[PDB]
Amino acid sequence: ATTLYLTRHGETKWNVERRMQGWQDSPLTEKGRQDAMRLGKRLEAVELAAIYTSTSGRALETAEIVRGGRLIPIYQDERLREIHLGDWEGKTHDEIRQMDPIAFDHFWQAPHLYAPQRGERFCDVQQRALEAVQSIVDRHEGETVLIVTHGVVLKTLMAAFKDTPLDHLWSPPYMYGTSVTIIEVDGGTFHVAVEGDVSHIEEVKEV
Numbered sequence: 001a002t003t004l005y006l007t008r009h010g011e012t013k014w015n016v017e018r019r020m021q022g023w024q025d026s027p028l029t030e031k032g033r034q035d036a037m038r039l040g041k042r043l044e045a046v047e048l049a050a051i052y053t054s055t056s057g058r059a060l061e062t063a064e065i066v067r068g069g070r071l072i073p074i075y076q077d078e079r080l081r082e083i084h085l086g087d088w089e090g091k092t093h094d095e096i097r098q099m100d101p102i103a104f105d106h107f108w109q110a111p112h113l114y115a116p117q118r119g120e121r122f123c124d125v126q127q128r129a130l131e132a133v134q135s136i137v138d139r140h141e142g143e144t145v146l147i148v149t150h151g152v153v154l155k156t157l158m159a160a161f162k163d164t165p166l167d168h169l170w171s172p173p174y175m176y177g178t179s180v181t182i183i184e185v186d187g188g189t190f191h192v193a194v195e196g197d198v199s200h201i202e203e204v205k206e207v
Contacts, residue, residue, distance in 0.1 A: 002137045003144040005046070006181040008151055009058040010036040010065075015177070015207045018092050022085030022119075025057040032058075035178040035201055036065035042180070042200045048072050049143040052136055054080035054150065062178070063148045079132035082150035083125045086118035111169040122166050126156035133157065137185055151175050161190040176204055 010032030014021050028036065043066065053063040055076045063074050088096050088104075096104050106114040111122050129149075136145060154175045159166060161183065173196040175181075182194035198204055 001142050002140050002185040004133070004136070004183040004185060005043070005048075005144070005146040006154060006157070006183060007039065007062075007066075007146065007148050008154060008175050008177050008179055009056070009062045009148065010177045011205065011207060012058045014090075018207075019090060020085050020088045020093075020096070021056075021058070022082055022089040023056075024089040028058060028061050031203070031205075032062075032177060033065060036062045037068070038200045038202070039178040039180070040066040040068045043146065044070075046146075047144055048146050049140060050075060051146045051148065052077060052080065052132075053148040054078070054082070054153075056081055056150070059148050059150065063146075066146070066148070077132050077135075079128040080147070080149045080153060083122070083152040084120045086116060088119075108170065110167065112165070112167040122152065122156055122169060125152055126160060126166065129153045129157050130160055154181065158192070158195065161192050174206060176201065177207070 010028045012021065012026045012028055012032060014026040016029060051063050051067060051072055051074045053059045053074060053076055055078050059080070060074070060076065067074065087099065103114060103116060115121055136147065155169050156166070159169055164171065175196050176198050178201065180194060180197040184191045184193050
């Protein structure tokens with residue numbers, strides 16, 4: 001019996017510039033911080049026992065804003081990091097299309113076919129993300145917690161819960177920054193109660 005709130009890091013500078021981050025990072029924009037604060041207000045009534053985040057700067061920064069001074073510990077776990085994108089990190093979509101067009105097409109169109117020389121495949125991410133989630137549940141029986149992570153991680157997790165194949169990884173809804181997803185874990189089963197809700201966000205950008 002555990003309730004899991006899942007969200008994505010707020011808008012960063014590279015998000016705006018359409019630059020892939022991966023394990024690299026960039027600071028939250030003004031909009032990002034605003035959205036993260038809007039989320040913190042939305043959860044002010046929710047009794048969070050803890051907050052888990054990836055070790056990425058943007059994830060941690062989002063988590064601090066949401067906590068907003070409240071007495072809640074923040075734990076960092078590498079298994080919650082966004083997918084490792086090697087050579088693509090720091091580069092724009094056009095720059096990447098110039099480098100490896102086929103792999104780039106697969107990334108977005110045929111996830112199951114994505115197989116880089118340097119970097120993780122979607123299945124590597126799904127496996128470590130699910131382990132982290134299970135470890136969190138194991139430590140919070142009867143409690144409610146918040147998990148601040150990333151886009152691909154969130155998508156691999158929804159795919160696992162909804163029992164869908166990775167080839168359909170990029171299925172709707174789009175996981176916007178600071179969006180709210182709620183998972184109810186009961187009887188050893190993950191039930192998706194809410195997915196990608198953005199009721200608290202003013203201007204929604206597909207970034």
